[PDB]
Amino acid sequence: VSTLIPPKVVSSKNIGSAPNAKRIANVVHFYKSLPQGPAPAIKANTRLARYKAKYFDGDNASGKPLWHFALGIIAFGYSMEYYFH
Amino acid sequence: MPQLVPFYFMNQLTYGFLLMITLLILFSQFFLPMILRLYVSRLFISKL
Incomplete structure (x- = not known):
């Protein structure tokens, strides 16, 4: 036949x-x-x-850390008024 | 009390302009190029 093949x-x-x-x-x-x-x-x-x-x-995005960060400044300026008083 | 009333404007303004200069340099060299670092990295990952 032909075994020549591509x-x-x-x-x-x-x-x-x-x-x-x-x-x-x-x-x-x-x-x-x-x-x-x-x-x-x-x-x-x-x-x-x-x-x-x-x-x-990254896990955190809930309001619990926001609250935690927030509370400090309220006590801070009130006391600092009395530290300056 | 004296601490509770500003009359100390020249002293005050020293502390004021110091905060601004600190932040200006701080943003410009550190934190703005560091956000741009995130952006560029995300984009090269996007590319490949």
Whole structure:
């Protein structure tokens, strides 16, 4: 018949196709785009990372920290009047 | 009491202009470019 056939030698579609550009981009750019980052500051013993943990975290958005922050100034100016009195 | 009545305007204004200069530099060099850092990073992630 003919055993001469096209698919037995290929050497340009075996490496050929466009998504290679996207590939070489995302192996180099993305491997240090860590899922949770490198564990950021959110709670630690400094006594203000604790403050961040309780009040000013991403989790927080409820009015409880707002209230907590608010109450201080009321006591502050009233006392400071009497510290200046 | 004296502390409770402003007459101390020249002293006061010293403390006033100090706060402004501090914030102006602080925003300009630190916090505004740091917000722009978030924006640029988000956009490059958007790009790839």
